[PDB]
């Protein structure tokens, strides 16, 4: 039972490390969007 | 001579007012581009 519950707590830490990477994928995808707006403000300055 | 000095004054005032009307039509064009860059600054802060 102690081996069966060591493996359970190992899976529960894998779920936290899975959700840390999923929240970082959604964060970098939002940083790619604001950088796409920073480039459009640099093309309008190029037009200016 | 007095007609020629008067005509020289009018041409200088003509080219000084034709330049100032050019400087305000150019300043009214750059304000449209700088007001579009500010739209991309607010759109960035909604993306941040």
TrEMBL record, chain B:
Domain of life from the UniProt record: Bacteria
Regions annotated as coiled coil: 13-48
Protein name: TcdA1
Species per Swiss-Prot/TrEMBL record: Photorhabdus luminescens (Xenorhabdus luminescens)
């Amino acid at each position: 039972i102690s081996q069966s519950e060591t493996y359970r707590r190992r899976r529960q830490e894998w779920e936290i490390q899975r959700n840390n990477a999923e929240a970082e994928l959604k964060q970098i995808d939002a940083q790619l969007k604001s950088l796409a707006v920073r480039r459009e403000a640099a093309v309008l300055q190029k037009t200016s | 001579t007095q007609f020629g000095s008067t005509l020289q004054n009018i041409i200088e005032r003509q080219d000084a007012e034709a330049l100032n009307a050019l400087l305000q039509n150019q300043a009214a064009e750059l304000i449209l581009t700088n007001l579009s860059i500010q739209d991309k600054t607010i759109e960035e802060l909604d993306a941040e």
